Design a protein around this ligand. Structure first.
Ligand SMILES: *[C@@H]1O[C@H](CO)[C@@H](O[C@@H]2O[C@H](CO)[C@@H](O[C@@H]3O[C@H](CO[C@H]4O[C@H](CO)[C@@H](O)[C@H](O[C@H]5O[C@H](CO)[C@@H](O)[C@H](O)[C@@H]5O[C@H]5O[C@H](CO)[C@@H](O)[C@H](O)[C@@H]5O)[C@@H]4O)[C@@H](O)[C@H](O[C@H]4O[C@H](CO)[C@@H](O)[C@H](O)[C@@H]4O[C@H]4O[C@H](CO)[C@@H](O)[C@H](O)[C@@H]4O)[C@@H]3O)[C@H](O)[C@H]2NC(C)=O)[C@H](O)[C@H]1NC(C)=O
Ligand SMILES: CC(=O)N1CCC(c2ccc3ncc(CC(=O)N(C)Cc4ccc(Cl)c(Cl)c4)c(=O)n3c2)CC1
Ligand SMILES: [Ca+2]
Ligand SMILES: [Ca+2]
Ligand code: NA
Ligand code: NA
Ligand SMILES: [Zn+2]
Length: 805
């Protein structure tokens, strides 16, 4: 109940929401149907429209008008945004030449440059070039400020998960807004686009920027807006708030536009009907900039122009139906459209079986336009699993398609021509970022980056300490003129042991065999030097990785590779090796096919054993440094050390062997050498973070050898590929992957074919940032380079996406 007979006189767009049952006058009151009776009359004035005309100039103030053109309007802070242009001979902001903003040029009483975040829904990245001729204000922001060619949203590429990511710096799995529609089984409650459950604070986790600011003494309301408040009134409200007294005035503001998304759904991303909404959003930007220019704030405020996701062509005819795959379609609940989430319709049905659902949805139709996954098997770069609101069964839908349960869902709901929500690496899903103001750089293009990084930058713009989040603070320092954050590298927690030769061959009883008994003081000293680290500068190019947790591990040197060998997990945490452009690929010699060799630097008690693999009929093994890339027949023996062995399902060995035998050399050829760091990952609780020992769910049968859930590789070379990877003077280039260690290749529908037709496609899907591997391993890479730390943080956040232009 709301006692709506209170009044909004003197309270229009008040910043502090008043508590029930008292009636409200803030920018969200309409959403709750709780505005005071006179909110429309007092707060949503529309008389005479939004623009001054010549006849209105110097008018007698009429308090009924939407905005004013009377002489007093500047001091009242309520002129129409074009007042100075029409009445005082001034230019529109868009018509002024851009001039570098070297320092904030702020009115007296401004303690810091305010931040205005201008969020556009469904603003696809390519609109910035394709729509440029119809968006002059946005084009000026872009060209004069700092811009990226595109910004990567989070998955799913839907509004609420992305806007809340922008506000918190958190993945959806961590902030809790994992879709536009959700069921929380603990709450037993549902969150929907339409309705009010979504207003309950229990859905919304993390700490959004307005709370971070308020806690630290910086005034900031929430960034939401009731949909019925017209954009011109939103802009005038922002400008009026900026005219508040110093002690009352916020330092951060948010404008939101539902366009161009609303039209994009109706017309497609590039429908001819899309030009008008782009023109209209541009005109709103120009109202804001003219309004700031009026207030003498146009060289004081930092403005961020940012989107939540892009927009793809999607029509009703491109729908896959689960009723064409499943017997039991009535026993499931599906969250449908551009992604699928499946759970049981009833928790009382004990005949519901996820295994049978997945199998019925796997590679059943030749051109099948979705792929089922158990959530832990989704690409780790999506960071979409560690939340109870994310159903165990997920469907990754191909761009341009939908999934639905039954055909009647689609015609008892063709209307629409656009949609979004797909994998966040998809080109059509990318969105925009421009920063303009004194704290951003001038006429600067930055590489594409992820929206999870922006919360830290907004905190830097405002002088705030960010709450713990998923950005990498410092990775976007290159966007900023000043206010950079100067991080220090984390401290190494565990220092390595450097074992020498400490065991005789006969101390080992590992059940391993090797034909290595086939027997010079020239090369004997040489092999000793290799074991003490003489080739280490070739194979460890960027320093040893730091271990950021407490553990026991050994550094092991070899002619062709270096590794950090865990005494606890019985295998390397990392193995590092460089392959030059001139490297030759060789075979595993016949006599060495089943060779495994005890490592006399590491105790039998801290070694794997071959008997465990013989007995585990499901599990085989591979090697981290590939024997195929040995520098000489003699060095090849090191590759068969038991300390280089890792457990691998036979189905995974098909993937791994092709990567090692074919793809590393291909990359070295293309990139002018590569440095490779490879290793295991254990993430049985799918939280994106390194497992401790007591979280491991699977071991090689009868042993303490833990089975990785994934294998990673980080592949580094010189950005200037005229220089070899091992003699690079400047910036680096990286690509990485986190491959799921699965006992089948059911994910790859073409896996019966030669590896040349499916393995690289799998790897591309499981592309990763170095930072993702850092979280999953507790290792810190690139500790010893010639590059600035912020540049290295940017490098660690890079994702190689394998998309076109
Ligand atoms: C992305 O960045 C984020 C932010 O840094 C990273 O997330 C952090 O990761 C930490 C480790 O997973 C985690 O720290 C834990 O916090 C527990 C206290 O949590 C509450 O308080 C914080 C701080 O205000 C708050 O943010 C939390 O918010 C979560 O939960 C609410 C509601 O439940 C949600 O609204 C909100 O969205 C958020 O949910 C997300 O996180 C939770 C986990 O906290 C997930 O379950 C959700 O699915 C969702 O992802 C909380 O309100 C604290 O209790 C933990 O300590 C336990 O674990 C340690 C191990 O070190 C152990 O030693 C302790 O004894 C203790 O164990 C006891 O409890 C166990 C569970 O019952 C039990 O099994 C034991 O036997 C013990 O009794 C721990 O310190 C931190 O909360 C999150 N923060 C956020 C916001 O998500 C994220 O890792 C980054 N991602 C990547 C990939 O890098
Ligand atoms: C967490 C919190 O403080 N809550 C209290 C307010 C509550 C809430 C009440 C009213 C409301 N009315 C309209 C919208 C639509 C909207 O504003 N948009 C689509 C833009 C937008 C802008 C910024 C962000 Cl971060 C997002 Cl996700 C969406 C909205 O979402 N509303 C929400 C939510 C919980
Ligand atoms: Ca949106
Ligand atoms: Ca984990
Ligand atoms: Na075996
Ligand atoms: Na297959
Ligand atoms: Zn939309």
């Amino acid at each position: 109940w709301t006692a709506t007979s209170g009044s909004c006189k003197g309270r229009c767009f008040e910043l502090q929401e008043v508590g029930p049952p008292d009636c409200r006058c803030d920018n969200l009151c309409k959403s709750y149907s709780s505005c005071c009776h006179d909110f429309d009359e007092l707060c949503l004035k529309t008389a005479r429209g939004w623009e001054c005309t010549k006849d209105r100039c110097g008018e007698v103030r009429n308090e009924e008008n939407a905005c004013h053109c009377s002489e007093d309007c500047l001091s009242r802070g309520d002129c129409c945004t074009n007042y100075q242009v029409v009445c005082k001979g001034e230019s529109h902001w868009v018509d002024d030449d851009c001039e570098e903003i070297k320092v904030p040029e702020c009115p007296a009483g401004f303690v810091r440059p305010p931040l205005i975040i201008f969020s556009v829904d469904g603003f696809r990245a390519s609109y910035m070039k394709k729509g440029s001729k119809v968006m002059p204000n946005i084009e000026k922001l872009r060209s004069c400020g700092t811009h990226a060619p595109y910004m990567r949203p989070v998955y799913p590429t839907k509004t609420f998960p992305n806007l809340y990511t922008l506000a918190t710096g958190l993945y959806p799995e961590s902030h809790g807004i994992v879709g536009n529609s959700m069921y929380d089984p603990v709450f037993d409650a549902s969150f929907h686009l339409r309705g009010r459950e979504k207003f309950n604070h229990r859905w919304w986790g993390g700490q959004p920027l307005w709370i971070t600011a308020t806690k630290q003494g910086v005034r900031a309301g929430t960034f939401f807006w009731s949909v019925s408040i017209p954009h011109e009134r939103r802009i005038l409200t922002i400008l009026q708030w900026l005219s508040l007294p110093d002690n009352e005035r916020p330092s951060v503001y948010a404008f939101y536009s539902e366009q161009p998304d609303f039209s994009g759904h109706k017309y497609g991303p590039f429908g001819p009907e899309m030009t008008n909404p782009l023109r209209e959003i541009d005109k709103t930007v120009g109202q804001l900039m003219d309004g700031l220019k009026q207030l003498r704030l146009h060289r004081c405020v930092n403005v961020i122009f940012v989107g939540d996701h892009g927009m793809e062509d999607v029509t009703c005819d491109r729908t896959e139906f689960l009723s064409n795959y499943l017997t039991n379609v009535d026993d499931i609940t599906l969250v449908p459209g551009t992604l699928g989430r499946i759970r049981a319709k009833s928790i009382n049905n004990s005949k519901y079986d996820p295994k049978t659902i997945i199998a019925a949805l796997t590679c059943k139709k030749p051109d099948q336009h979705f792929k089922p996954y158990m959530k832990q098997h989704l690409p780790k770069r999506l960071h979409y699993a560690n939340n109870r609101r994310i159903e165990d069964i997920h469907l990754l839908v191909d761009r341009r398609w939908h999934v639905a349960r039954k055909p009647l869902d689609v015609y008892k709901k063709c209307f629409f021509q656009g949609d979004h929500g797909f994998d966040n690496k998809v080109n059509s899903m990318q969105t925009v970022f421009v920063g303009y103001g004194p704290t951003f750089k001038y006429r600067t293009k930055v590489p594409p980056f992820e929206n999870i990084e922006l919360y830290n930058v907004m905190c830097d713009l405002l002088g705030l300490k960010p709450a713990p989040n998923n950005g990498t603070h410092g990775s976007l320092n290159h966007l900023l003129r000043t206010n950079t954050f100067r991080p220090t590298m984390p401290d190494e927690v565990s220092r390595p042991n450097y074992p020498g030769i400490m065991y005789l061959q006969s101390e080992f009883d590992l059940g391993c065999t090797c034909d290595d008994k086939v027997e010079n003081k020239l090369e004997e000293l040489n092999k000793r030097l290799h074991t003490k680290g003489s080739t280490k500068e070739r194979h460890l190019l960027y320093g040893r990785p730091a271990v950021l947790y407490r553990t026991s591990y050994d550094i092991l040197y070899h002619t062709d590779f270096e590794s950090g060998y865990s005494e606890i997990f019985l295998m390397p945490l990392w193995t590092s090796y460089t392959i030059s452009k001139q490297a030759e690929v060789s075979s595993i010699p016949e006599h060495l096919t089943n060779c495994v060799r005890p490592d006399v630097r590491v105790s039998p008690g801290f070694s794997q054993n071959c008997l465990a693999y013989k007995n585990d009929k499901q599990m085989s093994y591979g090697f981290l440094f590939p024997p195929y890339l040995s520098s000489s027949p003699e060095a090849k023996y090191d590759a068969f050390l038991v300390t280089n062995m890792v457990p691998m399902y036979p189905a995974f060995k098909r993937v791994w062997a092709y990567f090692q035998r074919v793809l590393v050399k291909k990359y070295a050829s293309e990139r002018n050498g590569v440095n490779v760091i490879s290793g295991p990952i254990f993430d049985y609780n799918y939280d994106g973070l390194r497992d401790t020992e007591d979280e491991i769910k699977q071991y090689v049968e009868g042993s303490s050898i833990p089975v990785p859930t994934h294998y990673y590789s980080i592949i580094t070379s010189c950005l200037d590929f005229t220089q070899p990877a091992d003699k690079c003077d400047g910036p680096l280039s990286v690509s990485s992957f986190i491959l799921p260690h699965r006992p089948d290749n059911d994910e790859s529908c073409n896996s019966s074919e030669d590896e040349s037709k499916w393995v690289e496609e799998l790897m591309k899907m499981h592309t990763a940032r170095v930072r993702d591997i850092e979280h999953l391993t507790g290792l810190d890479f690139y500790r010893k380079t010639s590059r600035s730390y912020s540049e290295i943080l940017t490098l660690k956040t890079y994702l190689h996406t394998y998309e076109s232009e």
